[PDB]
PDB file of C-alpha atoms (C1' of nucleotides) and ligand atoms in Angstrom:
ATOM      1  CA  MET A   1      -4.757  29.603   6.595  1.00  0.00           C
ATOM      2  CA  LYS A   2      -3.701  27.252   9.421  1.00  0.00           C
ATOM      3  CA  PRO A   3      -6.184  27.862  12.216  1.00  0.00           C
ATOM      4  CA  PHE A   4      -5.682  24.692  14.301  1.00  0.00           C
ATOM      5  CA  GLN A   5      -2.828  24.693  16.805  1.00  0.00           C
ATOM      6  CA  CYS A   6      -1.197  21.862  18.691  1.00  0.00           C
ATOM      7  CA  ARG A   7      -0.710  22.920  22.320  1.00  0.00           C
ATOM      8  CA  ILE A   8       2.314  20.636  22.733  1.00  0.00           C
ATOM      9  CA  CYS A   9       4.593  21.978  19.952  1.00  0.00           C
ATOM     10  CA  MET A  10       2.550  25.002  18.891  1.00  0.00           C
ATOM     11  CA  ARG A  11       2.518  23.976  15.220  1.00  0.00           C
ATOM     12  CA  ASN A  12      -0.542  25.164  13.267  1.00  0.00           C
ATOM     13  CA  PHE A  13      -2.482  23.101  10.737  1.00  0.00           C
ATOM     14  CA  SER A  14      -4.865  23.830   7.879  1.00  0.00           C
ATOM     15  CA  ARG A  15      -7.300  21.127   9.106  1.00  0.00           C
ATOM     16  CA  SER A  16      -8.743  20.153  12.439  1.00  0.00           C
ATOM     17  CA  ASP A  17      -8.731  16.385  11.685  1.00  0.00           C
ATOM     18  CA  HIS A  18      -5.043  16.690  10.738  1.00  0.00           C
ATOM     19  CA  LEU A  19      -4.392  18.446  14.053  1.00  0.00           C
ATOM     20  CA  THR A  20      -6.060  15.507  15.811  1.00  0.00           C
ATOM     21  CA  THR A  21      -3.929  12.855  14.129  1.00  0.00           C
ATOM     22  CA  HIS A  22      -0.761  15.007  14.517  1.00  0.00           C
ATOM     23  CA  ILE A  23      -1.325  15.115  18.299  1.00  0.00           C
ATOM     24  CA  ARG A  24      -0.968  11.283  18.305  1.00  0.00           C
ATOM     25  CA  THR A  25       2.731  11.836  17.369  1.00  0.00           C
ATOM     26  CA  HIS A  26       3.111  13.230  20.880  1.00  0.00           C
ATOM     27  CA  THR A  27       0.756  10.919  22.729  1.00  0.00           C
ATOM     28  CA  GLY A  28       1.604   7.639  21.087  1.00  0.00           C
ATOM     29  CA  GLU A  29      -2.084   6.854  20.674  1.00  0.00           C
ATOM     30  CA  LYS A  30      -2.727   4.100  18.050  1.00  0.00           C
ATOM     31  CA  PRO A  31      -6.489   3.598  17.825  1.00  0.00           C
ATOM     32  CA  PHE A  32      -6.625   1.387  14.704  1.00  0.00           C
ATOM     33  CA  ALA A  33      -5.790  -2.292  15.099  1.00  0.00           C
ATOM     34  CA  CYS A  34      -5.265  -4.596  12.107  1.00  0.00           C
ATOM     35  CA  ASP A  35      -7.945  -7.383  12.300  1.00  0.00           C
ATOM     36  CA  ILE A  36      -5.605  -9.908  10.834  1.00  0.00           C
ATOM     37  CA  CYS A  37      -2.421  -9.398  12.877  1.00  0.00           C
ATOM     38  CA  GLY A  38      -3.372  -6.956  15.595  1.00  0.00           C
ATOM     39  CA  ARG A  39      -0.774  -4.343  14.808  1.00  0.00           C
ATOM     40  CA  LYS A  40      -1.967  -0.882  15.990  1.00  0.00           C
ATOM     41  CA  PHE A  41      -1.774   2.363  13.991  1.00  0.00           C
ATOM     42  CA  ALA A  42      -2.340   6.076  14.695  1.00  0.00           C
ATOM     43  CA  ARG A  43      -4.546   6.529  11.604  1.00  0.00           C
ATOM     44  CA  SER A  44      -6.986   4.392   9.673  1.00  0.00           C
ATOM     45  CA  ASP A  45      -5.178   4.953   6.303  1.00  0.00           C
ATOM     46  CA  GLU A  46      -1.885   3.708   7.829  1.00  0.00           C
ATOM     47  CA  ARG A  47      -3.747   0.537   8.922  1.00  0.00           C
ATOM     48  CA  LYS A  48      -5.243   0.234   5.412  1.00  0.00           C
ATOM     49  CA  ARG A  49      -1.935   0.422   3.536  1.00  0.00           C
ATOM     50  CA  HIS A  50      -0.445  -2.072   5.983  1.00  0.00           C
ATOM     51  CA  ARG A  51      -3.362  -4.552   5.671  1.00  0.00           C
ATOM     52  CA  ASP A  52      -3.876  -4.161   1.899  1.00  0.00           C
ATOM     53  CA  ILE A  53      -0.334  -5.075   0.942  1.00  0.00           C
ATOM     54  CA  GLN A  54       0.870  -7.140   3.911  1.00  0.00           C
ATOM     55  CA  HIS A  55      -2.265  -9.298   4.027  1.00  0.00           C
ATOM     56  CA  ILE A  56      -4.909  -8.863   1.338  1.00  0.00           C
ATOM     57  CA  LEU A  57      -2.525  -8.851  -1.631  1.00  0.00           C
ATOM     58  CA  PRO A  58      -0.720 -12.169  -0.757  1.00  0.00           C
ATOM     59  CA  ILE A  59      -4.006 -13.814   0.429  1.00  0.00           C
ATOM     60  CA  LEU A  60      -5.556 -13.068  -2.963  1.00  0.00           C
ATOM     61  CA  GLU A  61      -2.376 -14.166  -4.814  1.00  0.00           C
ATOM     62  CA  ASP A  62      -2.421 -17.444  -2.824  1.00  0.00           C
ATOM     63  CA  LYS A  63      -6.134 -17.844  -3.516  1.00  0.00           C
ATOM     64  CA  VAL A  64      -5.606 -17.503  -7.252  1.00  0.00           C
ATOM     65  CA  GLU A  65      -2.921 -20.219  -7.174  1.00  0.00           C
ATOM     66  CA  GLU A  66      -5.110 -22.449  -5.021  1.00  0.00           C
ATOM     67  CA  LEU A  67      -8.113 -22.162  -7.343  1.00  0.00           C
ATOM     68  CA  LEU A  68      -6.048 -22.765 -10.465  1.00  0.00           C
ATOM     69  CA  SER A  69      -4.891 -25.956  -8.832  1.00  0.00           C
ATOM     70  CA  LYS A  70      -8.404 -27.018  -7.607  1.00  0.00           C
ATOM     71  CA  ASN A  71      -9.774 -26.317 -11.041  1.00  0.00           C
ATOM     72  CA  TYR A  72      -7.064 -28.456 -12.601  1.00  0.00           C
ATOM     73  CA  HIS A  73      -7.859 -31.392 -10.253  1.00  0.00           C
ATOM     74  CA  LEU A  74     -11.576 -31.079 -10.999  1.00  0.00           C
ATOM     75  CA  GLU A  75     -10.988 -30.928 -14.705  1.00  0.00           C
ATOM     76  CA  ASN A  76      -8.901 -34.124 -14.436  1.00  0.00           C
ATOM     77  CA  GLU A  77     -11.639 -35.854 -12.518  1.00  0.00           C
ATOM     78  CA  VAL A  78     -14.371 -34.600 -14.900  1.00  0.00           C
ATOM     79  CA  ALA A  79     -12.347 -35.980 -17.821  1.00  0.00           C
ATOM     80  CA  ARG A  80     -12.021 -39.392 -16.118  1.00  0.00           C
ATOM     81  CA  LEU A  81     -15.735 -39.529 -15.161  1.00  0.00           C
ATOM     82  CA  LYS A  82     -16.714 -38.612 -18.665  1.00  0.00           C
ATOM     83  CA  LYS A  83     -15.107 -41.719 -20.050  1.00  0.00           C
ATOM     84  CA  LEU A  84     -16.472 -44.039 -17.372  1.00  0.00           C
ATOM     85  CA  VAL A  85     -19.953 -42.831 -18.447  1.00  0.00           C
ATOM     86  CA  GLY A  86     -19.409 -42.323 -22.173  1.00  0.00           C
ATOM     87  CA  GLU A  87     -19.344 -38.726 -23.455  1.00  0.00           C
TER      88      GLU A  87
ATOM     89  CA  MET B   1      24.882  10.136  12.046  1.00  0.00           C
ATOM     90  CA  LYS B   2      24.071  12.405   9.063  1.00  0.00           C
ATOM     91  CA  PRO B   3      27.250  12.420   6.924  1.00  0.00           C
ATOM     92  CA  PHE B   4      25.597  13.121   3.548  1.00  0.00           C
ATOM     93  CA  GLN B   5      24.710  16.659   2.419  1.00  0.00           C
ATOM     94  CA  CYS B   6      22.350  17.922  -0.275  1.00  0.00           C
ATOM     95  CA  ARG B   7      24.194  20.675  -2.071  1.00  0.00           C
ATOM     96  CA  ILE B   8      20.936  22.371  -3.160  1.00  0.00           C
ATOM     97  CA  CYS B   9      19.268  22.953   0.219  1.00  0.00           C
ATOM     98  CA  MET B  10      22.151  22.001   2.574  1.00  0.00           C
ATOM     99  CA  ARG B  11      20.077  19.382   4.430  1.00  0.00           C
ATOM    100  CA  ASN B  12      22.120  16.495   5.924  1.00  0.00           C
ATOM    101  CA  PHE B  13      21.172  12.820   5.617  1.00  0.00           C
ATOM    102  CA  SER B  14      22.102   9.568   7.273  1.00  0.00           C
ATOM    103  CA  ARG B  15      22.308   7.657   3.921  1.00  0.00           C
ATOM    104  CA  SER B  16      23.531   8.115   0.358  1.00  0.00           C
ATOM    105  CA  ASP B  17      20.449   6.499  -1.234  1.00  0.00           C
ATOM    106  CA  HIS B  18      18.143   8.744   0.764  1.00  0.00           C
ATOM    107  CA  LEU B  19      20.176  11.785  -0.306  1.00  0.00           C
ATOM    108  CA  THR B  20      19.804  10.574  -3.934  1.00  0.00           C
ATOM    109  CA  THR B  21      16.027  10.229  -3.827  1.00  0.00           C
ATOM    110  CA  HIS B  22      15.740  13.484  -1.833  1.00  0.00           C
ATOM    111  CA  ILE B  23      17.561  15.346  -4.626  1.00  0.00           C
ATOM    112  CA  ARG B  24      14.803  14.231  -6.997  1.00  0.00           C
ATOM    113  CA  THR B  25      12.406  16.434  -5.001  1.00  0.00           C
ATOM    114  CA  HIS B  26      14.435  19.437  -6.236  1.00  0.00           C
ATOM    115  CA  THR B  27      14.863  18.297  -9.819  1.00  0.00           C
ATOM    116  CA  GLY B  28      11.417  16.844 -10.417  1.00  0.00           C
ATOM    117  CA  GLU B  29      12.904  13.555 -11.733  1.00  0.00           C
ATOM    118  CA  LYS B  30      10.356  10.680 -11.759  1.00  0.00           C
ATOM    119  CA  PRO B  31      12.050   7.544 -13.126  1.00  0.00           C
ATOM    120  CA  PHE B  32       9.242   5.075 -12.262  1.00  0.00           C
ATOM    121  CA  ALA B  33       6.209   4.785 -14.477  1.00  0.00           C
ATOM    122  CA  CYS B  34       3.224   2.614 -13.567  1.00  0.00           C
ATOM    123  CA  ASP B  35       2.922   0.097 -16.442  1.00  0.00           C
ATOM    124  CA  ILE B  36      -0.815   0.099 -16.142  1.00  0.00           C
ATOM    125  CA  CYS B  37      -1.811   3.770 -16.212  1.00  0.00           C
ATOM    126  CA  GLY B  38       1.539   5.403 -16.991  1.00  0.00           C
ATOM    127  CA  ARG B  39       1.656   7.683 -13.943  1.00  0.00           C
ATOM    128  CA  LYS B  40       5.266   8.625 -13.007  1.00  0.00           C
ATOM    129  CA  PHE B  41       6.881   8.478  -9.547  1.00  0.00           C
ATOM    130  CA  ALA B  42      10.130   9.610  -8.001  1.00  0.00           C
ATOM    131  CA  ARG B  43      10.674   6.231  -6.259  1.00  0.00           C
ATOM    132  CA  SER B  44       9.890   2.592  -6.969  1.00  0.00           C
ATOM    133  CA  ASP B  45       8.152   2.076  -3.607  1.00  0.00           C
ATOM    134  CA  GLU B  46       5.819   5.031  -4.428  1.00  0.00           C
ATOM    135  CA  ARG B  47       5.002   3.356  -7.737  1.00  0.00           C
ATOM    136  CA  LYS B  48       4.451   0.042  -5.934  1.00  0.00           C
ATOM    137  CA  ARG B  49       1.937   1.335  -3.303  1.00  0.00           C
ATOM    138  CA  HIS B  50       0.021   3.009  -6.135  1.00  0.00           C
ATOM    139  CA  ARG B  51      -0.007   0.012  -8.493  1.00  0.00           C
ATOM    140  CA  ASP B  52      -0.626  -2.643  -5.829  1.00  0.00           C
ATOM    141  CA  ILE B  53      -3.712  -0.971  -4.412  1.00  0.00           C
ATOM    142  CA  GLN B  54      -5.077   0.969  -7.370  1.00  0.00           C
ATOM    143  CA  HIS B  55      -4.661  -1.787  -9.968  1.00  0.00           C
ATOM    144  CA  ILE B  56      -3.549  -5.118  -8.589  1.00  0.00           C
ATOM    145  CA  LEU B  57      -6.031  -5.747  -5.792  1.00  0.00           C
ATOM    146  CA  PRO B  58      -9.048  -5.079  -8.039  1.00  0.00           C
ATOM    147  CA  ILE B  59      -7.440  -7.343 -10.676  1.00  0.00           C
ATOM    148  CA  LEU B  60      -6.900 -10.182  -8.185  1.00  0.00           C
ATOM    149  CA  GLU B  61     -10.493  -9.874  -6.896  1.00  0.00           C
ATOM    150  CA  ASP B  62     -11.783 -10.243 -10.445  1.00  0.00           C
ATOM    151  CA  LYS B  63      -9.517 -13.200 -11.038  1.00  0.00           C
ATOM    152  CA  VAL B  64     -10.680 -14.951  -7.886  1.00  0.00           C
ATOM    153  CA  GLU B  65     -14.331 -14.283  -8.850  1.00  0.00           C
ATOM    154  CA  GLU B  66     -13.721 -15.757 -12.299  1.00  0.00           C
ATOM    155  CA  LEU B  67     -11.896 -18.863 -10.970  1.00  0.00           C
ATOM    156  CA  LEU B  68     -14.563 -19.386  -8.257  1.00  0.00           C
ATOM    157  CA  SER B  69     -17.135 -19.372 -11.015  1.00  0.00           C
ATOM    158  CA  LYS B  70     -15.217 -22.025 -13.084  1.00  0.00           C
ATOM    159  CA  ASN B  71     -14.741 -24.037  -9.895  1.00  0.00           C
ATOM    160  CA  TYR B  72     -18.464 -23.958  -9.097  1.00  0.00           C
ATOM    161  CA  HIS B  73     -19.236 -25.240 -12.641  1.00  0.00           C
ATOM    162  CA  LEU B  74     -16.681 -28.029 -12.306  1.00  0.00           C
ATOM    163  CA  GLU B  75     -17.779 -29.148  -8.831  1.00  0.00           C
ATOM    164  CA  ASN B  76     -21.099 -29.498 -10.772  1.00  0.00           C
ATOM    165  CA  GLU B  77     -19.879 -31.536 -13.711  1.00  0.00           C
ATOM    166  CA  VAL B  78     -18.465 -33.882 -11.044  1.00  0.00           C
ATOM    167  CA  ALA B  79     -21.482 -34.345  -8.681  1.00  0.00           C
ATOM    168  CA  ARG B  80     -23.318 -34.907 -11.911  1.00  0.00           C
ATOM    169  CA  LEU B  81     -21.121 -37.394 -13.764  1.00  0.00           C
ATOM    170  CA  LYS B  82     -20.871 -39.380 -10.559  1.00  0.00           C
ATOM    171  CA  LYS B  83     -24.664 -39.621 -10.717  1.00  0.00           C
ATOM    172  CA  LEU B  84     -24.535 -41.007 -14.257  1.00  0.00           C
ATOM    173  CA  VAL B  85     -22.018 -43.480 -12.823  1.00  0.00           C
TER     174      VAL B  85
ATOM    175  C1'  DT C   1     -16.655  14.498   7.714  1.00  0.00           C
ATOM    176  C1'  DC C   2     -12.792  11.860   7.623  1.00  0.00           C
ATOM    177  C1'  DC C   3     -11.267   7.892   4.434  1.00  0.00           C
ATOM    178  C1'  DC C   4      -8.048   7.681   1.050  1.00  0.00           C
ATOM    179  C1'  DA C   5      -4.051   8.631  -1.718  1.00  0.00           C
ATOM    180  C1'  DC C   6       0.195  10.493  -2.476  1.00  0.00           C
ATOM    181  C1'  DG C   7       5.010  12.601  -1.294  1.00  0.00           C
ATOM    182  C1'  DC C   8       8.930  11.911   1.035  1.00  0.00           C
ATOM    183  C1'  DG C   9      11.885  11.114   5.469  1.00  0.00           C
ATOM    184  C1'  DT C  10      14.239   7.103   6.927  1.00  0.00           C
ATOM    185  C1'  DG C  11      15.138   2.275   9.024  1.00  0.00           C
ATOM    186  C1'  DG C  12      15.850  -2.715   7.435  1.00  0.00           C
ATOM    187  C1'  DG C  13      17.437  -6.292   4.090  1.00  0.00           C
TER     188       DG C  13
ATOM    189  C1'  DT D   1      21.709   5.546  -5.349  1.00  0.00           C
ATOM    190  C1'  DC D   2      18.686  -1.214  -5.184  1.00  0.00           C
ATOM    191  C1'  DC D   3      13.805  -3.217  -2.914  1.00  0.00           C
ATOM    192  C1'  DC D   4      10.439  -2.410   0.734  1.00  0.00           C
ATOM    193  C1'  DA D   5       7.494  -0.781   4.816  1.00  0.00           C
ATOM    194  C1'  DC D   6       5.841   2.550   7.826  1.00  0.00           C
ATOM    195  C1'  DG D   7       5.022   7.408   9.901  1.00  0.00           C
ATOM    196  C1'  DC D   8       3.147  11.485   9.128  1.00  0.00           C
ATOM    197  C1'  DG D   9       2.086  16.087   6.477  1.00  0.00           C
ATOM    198  C1'  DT D  10      -1.947  17.418   3.900  1.00  0.00           C
ATOM    199  C1'  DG D  11      -5.346  18.097  -0.216  1.00  0.00           C
ATOM    200  C1'  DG D  12      -9.392  15.831  -2.659  1.00  0.00           C
ATOM    201  C1'  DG D  13     -13.912  14.595  -2.503  1.00  0.00           C
TER     202       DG D  13
HETATM  203 ZN1  LIG E 101       2.379  19.109  18.101  1.00  0.00          ZN
HETATM  204 ZN1  LIG E 102      -1.740  -6.727  10.044  1.00  0.00          ZN
HETATM  205 ZN1  LIG E 103      17.968  19.285  -0.792  1.00  0.00          ZN
HETATM  206 ZN1  LIG E 104      -1.150   3.165 -12.328  1.00  0.00          ZN
END
DNA sequence: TCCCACGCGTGGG
DNA sequence: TCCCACGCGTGGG
């Protein structure tokens, strides 16, 4: 059953929310803006895939590298300090 | 602009690689398996979106949490030893 | 409800 | 046919 019809192209859809997003293919409406870069998308899931992989993934990869490095510097300092005070 | 043709459904395509992956929709071929859960995909980019979000992001979050914890304990052995000093 | 995932067309490198 | 990103159909929960 496809009870929801687009009045522009007359295509029917099984879901009303899918009819709503489909209509944006005609209107060009992009309600969802990425908070990091500002790129606009027609649907929230399109914004999510974009942000997850284009931003979150590399930010977390960079963070891991950064912490490994900070932790290495701190360990070096802790080792030095330990000798200055004994241990 | 669509010089390639699928001989199963007669659809025309702009590119040879796109014709190739399209044919997989008819044959059911899924060459790409996710190394983490084993799920199969027709294309590498399908496998990538799945793996990146379903497995990798959670993994990275855990890693960052773990490293942040080690960091916090080290920034503590330091403020401390410098007190002994 | 309507986010989320996935399939798959299709451009770029 | 390689890798990838994004649009957009559409079911699951
Ligand atoms: Zn329409
Ligand atoms: Zn963005
Ligand atoms: Zn075909
Ligand atoms: Zn997987």
